[PDB]
Design a protein around this nucleic acid. Sequence first.
RNA 1: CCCCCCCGGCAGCAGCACUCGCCGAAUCCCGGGGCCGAGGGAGCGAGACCCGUCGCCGCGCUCUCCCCCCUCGGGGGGGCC
RNA 2: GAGGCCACGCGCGCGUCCCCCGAAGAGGGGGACGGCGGAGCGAGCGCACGGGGUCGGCGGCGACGUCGGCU
RNA 3: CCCCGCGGACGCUACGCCGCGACGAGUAGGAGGGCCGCUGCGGUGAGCCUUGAAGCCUAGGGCGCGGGCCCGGGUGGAGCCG
Lengths: 225, 63, 240, 52
Amino acid sequence: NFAELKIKRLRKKFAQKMLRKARRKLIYEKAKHYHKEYRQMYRTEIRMARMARKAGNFYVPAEPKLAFVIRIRGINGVSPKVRKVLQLLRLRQIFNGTFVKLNKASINMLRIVEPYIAWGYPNLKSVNELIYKRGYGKINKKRIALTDNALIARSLGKYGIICMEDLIHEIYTVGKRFKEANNFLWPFKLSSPRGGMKKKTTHFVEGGDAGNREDQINRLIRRMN
Amino acid sequence: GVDIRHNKDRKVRRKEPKSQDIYLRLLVKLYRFLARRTNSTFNQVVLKRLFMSRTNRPPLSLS
Amino acid sequence: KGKPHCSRNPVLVRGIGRYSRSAMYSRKAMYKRKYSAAKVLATVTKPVGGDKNGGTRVVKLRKMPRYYPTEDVPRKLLSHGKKPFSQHVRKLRASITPGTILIILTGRHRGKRVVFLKQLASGLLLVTGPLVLNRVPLRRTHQKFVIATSTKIDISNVKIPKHLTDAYFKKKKLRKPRHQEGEIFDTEKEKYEITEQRKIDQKAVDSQILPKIKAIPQLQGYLRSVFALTNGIYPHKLVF
Amino acid sequence: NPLKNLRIMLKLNPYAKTMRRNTILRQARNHKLRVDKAAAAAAALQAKSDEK
RNA sequence: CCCCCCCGGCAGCAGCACUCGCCGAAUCCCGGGGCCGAGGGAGCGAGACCCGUCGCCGCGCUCUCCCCCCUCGGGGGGGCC
RNA sequence: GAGGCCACGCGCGCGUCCCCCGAAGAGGGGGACGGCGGAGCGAGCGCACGGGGUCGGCGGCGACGUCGGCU
RNA sequence: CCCCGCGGACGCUACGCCGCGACGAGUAGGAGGGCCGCUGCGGUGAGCCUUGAAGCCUAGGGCGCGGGCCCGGGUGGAGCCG
Ligand SMILES: [Mg+2]
Ligand SMILES: [Mg+2]
Ligand SMILES: [Mg+2]
Ligand SMILES: [Mg+2]
Ligand SMILES: [Mg+2]
Ligand SMILES: [Mg+2]
Ligand SMILES: [Mg+2]
Ligand SMILES: [Mg+2]
C-alpha cells in the first residue's frame, strides 16, 4: 500500500497548493479592485467640487465618517466619566490610537473626552501606515502581530475580510462589519510625537493639541509612528 | 502607565487536588490526558470535579 | 538538456523585475513549454584473502563512533541568509577610483600618501605609494582607514600583474609544528624576508606608475610629504 | 516591517509589487520626458540666440 | 504707477531666478550614523545517515528553437504563437 | 489601420453572446466568455528585502615581567 | 514486502517540561512560596570526623533578587551535618 499512500499524500499536497494559489490570486485581484475604487473616490471628490465651481455654486463634501483618536494625557487624576469613556474607546494608555466610526453617539463621547484626546480624519496613507507598521490583532484575547494573512482570515473571514487589504478597506470605507474589523485590531501603541507637541493642555484651535484637528491628525500620525 | 485594575487578575479556582491521595492523583493524570486530548466536555467536567473538595463532592444516595 | 539563457527579466529595482508575470510568461513562451509526465555505495565488497576465510568481506565505510560524549548540543535553526565572508558583496566608496591618491591613517605607514590601484577580492585596496617615494610597497589597506583625496593620476592602460591577489598578500607564519612546550626560544624567522618575487613585482609596477607621477609637477614631492593636522586646520573644513 | 521589507509586504499584499513596478516605470518615463523637454527648451534658446 | 480693455500670445507653473500652500493608491530610489543578534531538531521526505542550504512569499534557467554583442567554452541580450 | 497593459494561455463536448450565408430569419460554418461535464503526476537546478547572526574573515601580544578577574 | 548500510540527538523529577500574550507603585492589612535560618524527635545518607567535629577569625574564590549558603587559609581539639 506504499505506492497508494504516496499517491494519496501527493494528491492532498497538490490540492492544498492549488487552493493556496487560488486564494493568493483572489487576494491580488481584490487589492487591484480596491486600488481602482480608491482612485475613483479621490477623483470623484475633485470632479464634484470642479463642477460646482464651474456652475458658481458650492459643493459641500460628505461629513467624514472615520476618525482616528489618540489619547494624549496620562492616567493620573482623571474624572470618572472621562475615565469611563476612555475605557470604552479602548484608550487606557497615553499615545494609544483607535479608529472610531463617527456618528452622533461617538461624537458626543469624543466631546466628553475632548481635553484628553487629539482626534481627526485619517487619510488612506495614514490608515495604511497604521495597519502595516503597528497593526496587531486581538486573537484569542492575545496581542498578535499581523505577520500573515491567515491570522486575519481565521478571525474575520466569516465577514469577508481575509487580508491586510480587506482590513484596510473595511477600516477606511466604513463598511458593514466595521465594528468587528475595528475591534479585531488591538489599539495602536504609538510612540511619542517626534518633534514634540505644541501644548497638550489646551485645544488645537487655541494653539494646543487637544480636541478635533480636522485633517492635521495625519501630520500628527506621521510624527507619531 | 495603563489604566487597568489588577484586583481580579488571578482567577481563584482549583488547578489540582489539594489531596495527597496517590490513587486520586493517578486518575487525575488519566483524566487530565483525556480532557486535553479529547473534545469531550464530559472529561473536562469530570477532571474539574476530581479537583474539588469533599464539601463540593457531596455523597449521592442510592435513592 | 538545453543551453542556459540570460534572465530575460531585467532588474530595474532590487527585488523587482521590469516585466510582469504574464509578460514574462509570453517572453519565456511557457505556452508551448508545457510538461505533464515522462546512490553512493556505503559498503564495498573486498576479497579478504587467505584460505577458508569465507569468500569476501562486506566492509562498510564510515564505521559507527567508538565513543559518545555524555551529552550533546542541539542543532541550530535555519537563518536563510548570513553568507560567508568570501561570498559577501564588496562595496567601494565613490571617491576611490584607480589612480587616486589616498592617505593612510593607521599602521607604520601612518599619514603617508599612496596611489590606489585596485580593489581586491576581499574588498581591501591594493596601494603602492611608490617605494622610491615614501617607502610604501605593494601593500593591502582598508578603505575604511584611508582618506581619498581629490588628486588623481590616470593609471589606466597599466598592467597590474594577475597574481597580485589576497592569497599573494596574505601573511605567512612558521610556528608551531614539531614543538609543544617552549624551553628553547622559537624567536627565529621573526625577521620577515622580502621575497625576490615581491621585489620584481614592485619594480614592475613602479616602472610604469612613476612616469605618470612625474607627468604632473611636484606630485612626487606631494607623495614624499606626509599628512598632518596643523593647529589651525580642522578636518571637517578641509577639502581633500 | 512592511513598507520597509519588500518581501514581507509582498507576503501580506502581492499587488504591492505591481503597484511599485508601475510607479517606478511611470516615474522613469516622466523624468525622461521632463529631461527631454528641458533639453529641447535649452536647444531652442541656443538656436534663437545663435541663429545667425 | 494704478484700473478697465476688442482681446491677448509664448514659456514656465506651488519654479533647478529659495515670493506665498495642502498633500501622496495623486510615491518611489539611494546613502550615512547609532543601538541590538533574543531564539536554536523548521526534514510527511529518501524509509533520512557530512551540519535538515527547510516552510511561507518573490523571482531566474532548463527539460523548444533561432539569432545578436563581447570574451575563448564563458558572460551579456532580443524573443519563439 | 504600417503603441501600452493583463496574476490572459491544452484539447473534446456542453451552455451564453457576437458573425456568415440564412435554400421557412430552418441547417451548418466561425470568434469571445464560462464559475459547466466520469475518471490520478510535472522534476531539476539555482537567486533571495522570505518563520530573530553569521563569516567556509583577519591582526597583535604573551613569564620573575606582564594578561584577565565589573565582585 | 524498506534494507549495498540493521541505523538515527535531547526529552516526560507529568508536583515535569515547553509555547504565546498582557502585566509589575504601596502604608494598615490579607495570602502564597521559601533547595531561607535555629533547636530537638522518628526515618534515611553502608553520611562526615583525631590523616582533625563544633565554634571562631580571614585584603581568599564564588553562588542566590533575597533570606542566606558552599568552598580555600588559619585557630581549635570532639563531636557534626544533608
Ligand atoms: Mg495632573
Ligand atoms: Mg531630535
Ligand atoms: Mg490640569
Ligand atoms: Mg508598567
Ligand atoms: Mg496593585
Ligand atoms: Mg513641484
Ligand atoms: Mg542566539
Ligand atoms: Mg507590588
